[PDB]
């Protein structure tokens, strides 16, 4: 169950582009008309094709993949998709060959993307930290890394690590969610936000035994970049946010994350972080912020000392 816009856009993506994809989600955010999107690990192009639509004719998408076979599928269907299905003059997609760890080697410049998206390929990175820090480098201010991947509620035993088989799909090398958060924050994503999580029921029964009581999740994370603004606690500057109702397919309400649902025209008290995420990012044209950060009031939703 993807949002209607994503299902509508999927109906029209070349069967072959979809059949050849494999992923744990549909990580294209709402609100991206006219923006530039980088799709990490684009494979055969399902997610890039969907984005190419949702950003409109004036937005664009870049897909980076490791495998030439997968590339050539994304490339061969581009023009025809963009022309007949989207009715664009030409494809607004560019697929390039690369390693997600080395966006600099792929020629991707600082601040050249508004969104970085990914679908269940980061657990396979040999250098998670580099992919994260590269995402961070190629994002423009007020941009976001928005991506889905598989996590665990605890650290897997070393035993399970380097010798699983392939196991699960990449369930080996799925991190303890809080360890992921830590790594994101070392790189400058100070307050990752969980948009939604689904427990992945394991059901192999023989794998059950290998993992103990480990619980696995498919989580879509939101990693906003707002330099100088994003803090590691909810801090209280007395700001108020009002979602104006203008994000297509979200006229009644908008979920920033699973703890923050904004109802159209209903003001809500927010912390600095959240005010930055909805009002200083690419989402900002759809929100009003009342207040600012000239006066600090303390920690938000919590008393002072003890
Ligand atoms: Na709505």
Query: What is the 3D form?
Result: globular
Over all CA atoms, what is the radius of gyration?
Answer: 20 Å
CATH superfamily membership of the largest domain? Vaccinia Virus protein VP39
Helix content: 25-40%
The structural domain count equals 2
Q: Could you say which structural class the secondary elements and strand pairing correspond to? A: alpha/beta
Amino- and carboxy-terminal Cα gap: 44 Å
Count of individual helical segments: 10
Bound molecules: sodium ion
Topology as a string of helices (H) and strands (E) = HHEHEHHEEHEHHEHEEEEEEHEE
PDB class: transferase
Keywords: methyltransferase, Arsenic Methyltransferase, transferase
Assembly: monomeric
Entry title: X-ray crystal structure of CrArsM, an arsenic (III) S-adenosylmethionine methyltransferase from Chlamydomonas reinhardtii
Can I get a quick summary?
The protein is α/β, with parallel strands linked by helices and 306 residues long. Helices cover 26% and strands 25% of the residues. It folds into 2 domains: 1-235, Vaccinia Virus protein VP39 (Rossmann fold), CATH 3.40.50.150; 236-306, no CATH class.
Describe this structure in words.
The structure is a monomer. With 306 residues, this protein is of the alpha/beta class. The protein folds into two domains: 1-235, Rossmann fold; 236-306, no CATH class. 26% of the residues lie in helices and 25% in strands. A seven-stranded mixed β-sheet has the order 3-2-1-4-5-7-6. A three-stranded antiparallel β-sheet has the order 12-9-13. Bound molecules: sodium ion (NA). Residues 250-253 line the site of sodium ion (NA).
């Amino acid at each position: 169950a993807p949002p209607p816009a994503v299902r509508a856009a999927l109906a029209d993506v070349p069967t072959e582009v979809k059949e050849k994809f494999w992923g744990c989600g549909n990580p294209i955010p709402a609100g991206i008309e006219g923006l530039r999107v980088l799709d990490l690990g684009a494979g055969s192009g399902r997610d890039a094709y969907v984005a190419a639509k949702l950003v409109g004719e004036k937005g664009s998408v870049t897909g980076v993949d490791m495998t030439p076979a997968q590339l050539e599928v994304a490339i061969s269907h581009a023009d025809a998709y963009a022309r007949d299905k989207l009715g664009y003059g030409k494809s607004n997609m560019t697929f390039i060959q690369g390693e997600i760890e080395y966006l600099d080697r792929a020629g991707l410049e600082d601040s050249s993307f508004d969104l970085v998206i990914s679908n269940c390929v980061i657990n396979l990175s040999p250098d998670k930290a580099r992919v994260l820090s590269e995402a961070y480098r190629v994002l423009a201010p007020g941009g976001e890394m928005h991506f889905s991947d598989v996590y665990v509620d605890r650290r897997l035993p070393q035993s399970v690590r380097s010798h699983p088989v392939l196991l699960g799909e990449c369930l080996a090398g799925a991190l303890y969610n809080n360890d992921f958060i830590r790594l994101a924050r070392k790189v400058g994503f100070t307050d990752p936000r969980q948009l939604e999580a689904e427990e992945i029921q394991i059901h192999d029964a023989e794998l059950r035994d290998q993992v103990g009581e480990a619980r696995f999740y498919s989580i879509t994370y939101r990693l906003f970049k707002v330099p100088g603004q994003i803090e590691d606690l909810a801090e209280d500057y007395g700001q108020v946010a009002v979602y104006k109702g203008t994000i297509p397919g979200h006229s009644h309400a908008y979920d920033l994350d699973d703890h923050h649902r904004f109802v159209t025209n209903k003001p809500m008290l927010v912390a600095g972080n959240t005010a930055s995420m909805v009002g200083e990012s690419y989402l900002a044209p759809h929100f009003t912020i009342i207040g600012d950060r000239a006066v600090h009031y303390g920690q938000f939703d919590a008393s002072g000392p003890k």
